[PDB]
With several copies, the nearest count.
Chain A
Amino acid sequence: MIGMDRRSGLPLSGLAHLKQSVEDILTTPLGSRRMRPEYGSKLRRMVDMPVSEGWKSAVQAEVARSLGRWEPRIGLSAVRVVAVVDGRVDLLLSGVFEG
């Protein structure tokens, strides 16, 4: 599939089109799109929730949900919480490459 780049308008198909779709999904909220209230992620609503073992069960679900809905060309490998520094939660998201 051939799409356009977000900045600079360039037609890129494989590498950055798969990256500009996933990295947008993690920070786009629900209801921000016009007439599409189910596109986006609950990750903007996961801010200031307490970091529990049931919270990681939700983020690994919402990564698998919001990318499983609207990005079928990405196979998710692992969403591991690797560091809690100063309230900042480091979640490693290693994704496979297709095409």
Chain B
Amino acid sequence: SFFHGVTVTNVDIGARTIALPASSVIGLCDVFTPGAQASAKPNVPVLLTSKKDAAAAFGIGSSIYLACEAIYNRAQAVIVAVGVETAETPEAQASAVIGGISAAGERTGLQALLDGKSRFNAQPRLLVAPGHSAQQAVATAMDGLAEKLRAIAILDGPNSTDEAAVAYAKNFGSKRLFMVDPGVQVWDSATNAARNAPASAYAAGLFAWTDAEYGFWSSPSNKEIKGVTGTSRPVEFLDGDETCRANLLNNANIATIIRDDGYRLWGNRTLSSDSKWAFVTRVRTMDLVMDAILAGHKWAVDRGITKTYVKDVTEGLRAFMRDLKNQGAVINFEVYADPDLNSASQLAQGKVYWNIRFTDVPPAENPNFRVEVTDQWLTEVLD
């Protein structure tokens, strides 16, 4: 007799659910002055969820509170702020934003944003270093950091002319970089005059607002920036001319702020050499469905390949993509177990392959109209 009694087993062959990792955590790193009013150490990350928390952690008047003010005036999201201390030379300030590692074995500058998931369970999806991204050392260290986090690092070019902004954007070529060139001229409440903002935290207030109002599949490239009241070196886009000054910047993969004082962000082309990954919509939805599957399938790592295992991963994977299809994130999908890559020798090593083919919903960056007069209905007036 194996067992003599009543056995109640649990077979546990249900298809699990897949959640998205909230898509709007903003990684911030800017200068702040430590002291009595600043409740943050000058290299550790601080989780921020309100404007009151940003002033209680870094103090009013800091360069990182002015970046948190630009985000919380437009959106309402979670900021992983690092905060660095002021150096003497402006060159050594760029060494502190990049950071690296400390003598105690801890990350210092932008590298502390890699600690945003192991300390707060919120991986930053928007990498913003306002003011310092115009320097090529910081922007190329935020470019390699945006691939470690699958984030979209929002650069901002220098406030020089458009020849120096195009020549600055010719250095990057990587699909996770979004360059917003013309500087926001915002009103300062302290001096009662207009000050110049780097226009990179204001773009982060649009990537965090459009995900909570329109979805992560919707580009922020026509949405209002409420806080601004000016734009240094204002761009030209009149009505429909393909040869405007702002359109020659969007042609060179640079986002602009078009209208009177720039109350419309303009541009959904990331700094990508491949025209497949050109749109920020396709990059953002790809890095969101590649992390929902990665962080959502850690229950199936030693389950054992049975016929009800492959079918209940696939049916739990179609149900994730079908909750994205009617939501508007994709057009149509195709999730299936791979017939070729699931060989007898691949399955004997524990490898089992699934293919998730889908279509992102592209942004209508150019609705073309073709109006014409005819004579077909000219014979209609006869009876």
Contacts and interface: CB of A to CB of B under 8 A. Distances in A.
Complex A–B touching at CB under 8 A: yes
A44 B8 contact: no
A26 B6 contact: yes
Contacts of B6: 26-27, 43-44, 47
Contacts of A88: 2
Q: Is the interface of B mostly helix, strand, loop or mixed?
A: loop
Nearest to B12: A19
A23 interface: yes
Nearest to B5: A47
B161 interface: no
| Interface residue range, chain B | under 10
Interface residues of A, number: 9
Nearest to A43: B6
Interface in A35-57: 43-44, 47
B308 to A, nearest CB: 13
Contacts of A26: 6, 8
B349 interface: no
Interface string A10-27: 000000000100010011
Contacts of A43: 6
B10 interface: yes
Contacts of B2: 86, 88
Contacts of B5: 27, 47
Interface in A42-96: 43-44, 47, 86, 88
B2 to A, nearest CB: 8
Nearest to A16: B10
Contacts of B10: 19, 23
User: Could you say which of B2, B5, B8, B10 has the most chain A C-beta atoms within 10 Å of its C-beta?
Assistant: B8
Contacts of A19: 10
Interface string B1-43: 0100110101000000000000000000000000000000000
A60 to B, nearest CB: 16
Nearest to A85: B2
B1 to A, nearest CB: 8
Nearest to B4: A47
B16 to A, nearest CB: 10
Interface string B258-278: 000000000000000000000
12 contacts: A23-B8, A23-B10, A26-B6, A26-B8, A27-B6, A27-B8, A43-B6, A44-B6, A47-B5, A47-B6, A86-B2, A88-B2
Query: 10 closest Cβ contacts across the A-B interface?
Result: A23-B8, A27-B6, A26-B8, A27-B8, A43-B6, A44-B6, A26-B6, A19-B10, A23-B10, A47-B6
Interface of A: 19, 23, 26-27, 43-44, 47, 86, 88
Given A19-B10, A26-B8, 12 more contacts: A23-B8, A23-B10, A26-B6, A27-B5, A27-B6, A27-B8, A43-B6, A44-B6, A47-B5, A47-B6, A86-B2, A88-B2
